[PDB]
Amino acid sequence: KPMSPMQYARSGLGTAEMNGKLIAAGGYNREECLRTVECYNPHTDHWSFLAPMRTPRARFQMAVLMGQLYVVGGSNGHSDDLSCGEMYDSNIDDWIPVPELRTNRCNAGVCALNGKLYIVGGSGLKNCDVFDPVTKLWTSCAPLNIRRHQSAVCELGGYLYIIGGAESWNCLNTVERYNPENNTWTLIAPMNVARRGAGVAVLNGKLFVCGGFDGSHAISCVEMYDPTRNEWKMMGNMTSPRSNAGIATVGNTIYAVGGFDGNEFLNTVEVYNLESNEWSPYTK
Helix, strand or coil: CCCCCCCCEEEEEEEEEEEEEEEEEECCCCCCEECCEEEEEEECCCEEEECCCCCEECHHHHHHEEEEEEEECCECCCCEEECCEEEEECCCCEEEEEEEHHEEEECCEEEEEECCCEEEEECCCCCEEEEEEECCCEEEEECCCCEEEEEEEEEEEEEEEEEECCCCCCEEEEEEEEECCCCCECCCCCCCCCECCCEEEECCCCEEEECCCCCCECCCEEEEEEECEEEEEECCCCCCCCCCCEEEEECCCCEEEEEEEECCEECEEEEEEEEEEEEEEECC
């Protein structure tokens, strides 16, 4: 049996783990930008709804900070000049607007680290900025070495990683690591495949970068980065090509959901088996 798909096809969505479930928030499809938020329960193979976001939002990366979901950046169904960010309270199942998280900036990476929220790149840019939820203030950080938008961003071991993206129209295979203890971005080993709009999930101390757009196709290629050897390795391909999908670790298992395959916006989800190095679209 194919895993249950979402009710809405979604590209350029936010994704995260929460309470053992896969959260798919916003995004856009052929008809509209979306405010709905869906939640996949792997152990039951059912999607459910969370409270919808106040306003439709796409082309953002969602972050988890102090257990709460933060949506920052992106665009609605008319412009990128968003008046506020939003945060989700699972205690009450509702989204609260955060005016201090307003942005005029899409395709930017967003990630939590040491209790603060970093926004990196975006439509590309070298800017990196940090929001402290305690003070609700923004501070600038060291800039990227290379202009980037539609990059994959993630945190591991106290460091940030920004992965690929597009500089202008050209897709990048280069990767940069942020050290907050000396406030530097350092180029590290590049990926084998240059990709805009890839997704990234952290699993067992390794980074799995999945799919994206290589300048020509939506791709199913998956590459793993091992920080202890500063090297990348080709992994099993996803069962569908997915550009601007949602990639997340849930229950210490990697899922890919939604995206765009070059012809259609996708509502499917698939799962990675680390032991066998194989993706599957089916449930037990």
